């Protein structure tokens with residue numbers, strides 16, 4: 001029993017765009033842009049749509065980089081997050097009521113103000129690796145157990 005989500009990272013050779021989420025799940029943490037996939041749309045179409053909705057950017061080619069499943073103990077639905085990366089965007093990032101975007105240098109990623117799993121897989125994304133991950137959380141701050149592996153095909 002899992003629900004599909006997307007997460008898009010705008011990753012350029014020396015910087016990455018993250019957005020500080022202002023409301024909903026994960027508010028108060030920096031993250032990529034994404035959300036729930038809708039009925040009748042492909043995962044990739046959902047990722048492109050969520051990127052525009054949350055950041056104001058237009059992406060053409062999106063590259064699959066990872067799949068991470070999240071389990072929150074006591075919550076029945078698993079979150080099946082499909083992670084994508086793009087180095088080619090149009091438009092300038094837009095700050096809205098839902099999100100505050102900011103560019104970060106690759107050696108200045110704000111891990112202390114991100115979901116804790118990001119410290120595990122974000123360095124794989126930075127080195128252009130692809131991965132499958134599973135993280136079991138107790139609440140929103142504690143990782144109880146996890147698995148993470150590099151793959152050739154997402």
Ligand SMILES: Nc1nc2c([nH]c(=O)n2[C@H]2C[C@H](O)[C@@H](COP(=O)(O)OP(=O)(O)OP(=O)(O)O)O2)c(=O)[nH]1
Pocket residue numbers: 005006007008024025026031032033034035036037070079081115116117118
């Ligand atoms: N980096 C990172 N991203 C995560 C984690 N957990 C998690 O759900 N996400 C991402 C996946 C999605 O992009 C987003 C959660 O989706 P969302 O609840 O905001 O979706 P939504 O905007 O479509 O829903 P709604 O509130 O508008 O109805 O956060 C995590 O541990 N790390």
